[PDB]
Amino acid sequence: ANRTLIVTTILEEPYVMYRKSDKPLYGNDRFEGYCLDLLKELSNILGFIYDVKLVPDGKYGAQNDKGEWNGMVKELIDHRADLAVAPLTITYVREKVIDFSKPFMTLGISILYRKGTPIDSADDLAKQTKIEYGAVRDGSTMTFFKKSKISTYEKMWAFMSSRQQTALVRNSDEGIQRVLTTDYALLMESTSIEYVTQRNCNLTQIGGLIDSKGYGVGTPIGSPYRDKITIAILQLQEEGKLHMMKEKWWRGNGCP
Numbered sequence: 649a650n651r652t653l654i655v656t657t658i659l660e661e662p663y664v665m666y667r668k669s670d671k672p673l674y675g676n677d678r679f680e681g682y683c684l685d686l687l688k689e690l691s692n693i694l695g696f697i698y699d700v701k702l703v704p705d706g707k708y709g710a711q712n713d714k715g716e717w718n719g720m721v722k723e724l725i726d727h728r729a730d731l732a733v734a735p736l737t738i739t740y741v742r743e744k745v746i747d748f749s750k751p752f753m754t755l756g757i758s759i760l761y762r763k764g765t766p767i768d769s770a771d772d773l774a775k776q777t778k779i780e781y782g783a784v785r786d787g788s789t790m791t792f793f794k795k796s797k798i799s800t801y802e803k804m805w806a807f808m809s810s811r812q813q814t815a816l817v818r819n820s821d822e823g824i825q826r827v828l829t830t831d832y833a834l835l836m837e838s839t840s841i842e843y844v845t846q847r848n849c850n851l852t853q854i855g856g857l858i859d860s861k862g863y864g865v866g867t868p869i870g871s872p873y874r875d876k877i878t879i880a881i882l883q884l885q886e887e888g889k890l891h892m893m894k895e896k897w898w899r900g901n902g903c904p
């Protein structure tokens with residue numbers, strides 16, 4: 649039989665979550681979410697089974713000064729996993745070092761905050777000195793700011809960098825808690841903002857989307873699976889399955 653594929657992934661609602669249970673769960677049964685459903689669909693089309701493994705360092709992936717990567721991206725570069733199935737953003741810097749499938753979802757960076765402030769945009773957020781802000785450490789949102797040549801965003805990066813210990817958060821859970829408990833706004837992808845703001849009515853998006861991009865399945869460069877995964881994604885796209893999966897996992901209007 650075909651070798652069982654190793655899938656690197658990361659906890660991120662509603663893509664990859666621990667299934668609720670009255671008893672201990674093991675293996676792939678521990679997890680549920682959009683990305684688990686995506687894997688069930690892709691694996692049917694391609695003819696494989698798979699082992700879901702959370703990325704040990706809990707990061708999506710960014711490169712340091714020497715060009716050393718971490719996170720799921722490093723797992724692929726180092727051939728520790730066959731696929732990364734996650735809300736993994738397709739970017740120029742990543743595409744140079746791994747092979748992404750075509751996108752299964754699109755999104756853009758925006759701002760998550762609490763209600764009641766006059767802040768209406770990134771410009772407003774960067775200018776004011778009352779609220780802290782930042783991004784998840786070593787993901788694509790952080791990298792967007794790090795790489796930006798747009799003045800407002802360059803300033804925002806300098807700010808995050810100067811306060812990195814608190815401005816750059818471990819993961820989206822800590823980021824959201826920071827928003828709820830302190831005067832902090834989180835730079836976050838719009839699909840996650842849509843999910844959280846329909847569930848916690850104390851939270852809101854600020855401004856519009858500041859970029860536009862997609863999530864793709866990651867594979868190591870030269871992978872014999874990337875092209876088959878792309879073809880499978882297009883099938884699911886065209887058949888309306890991706891849309892159905894989004895509807896299934898996004899709770900729909902819970903807040904005014």
Ligand SMILES: N[C@@H](C[C@]1(C(=O)O)C[C@H]2OC[C@@H](O)[C@@H](O)[C@H]2O1)C(=O)O
Pocket residue numbers: 660708709735736737738784786787788789790819820835836837838840
């Ligand atoms: N999708 C990103 C990771 C991340 C981000 O950098 O914004 C972290 C996590 O943060 C919350 C929300 O944006 C979610 O999609 C996740 O995106 C990536 O591939 O690096």
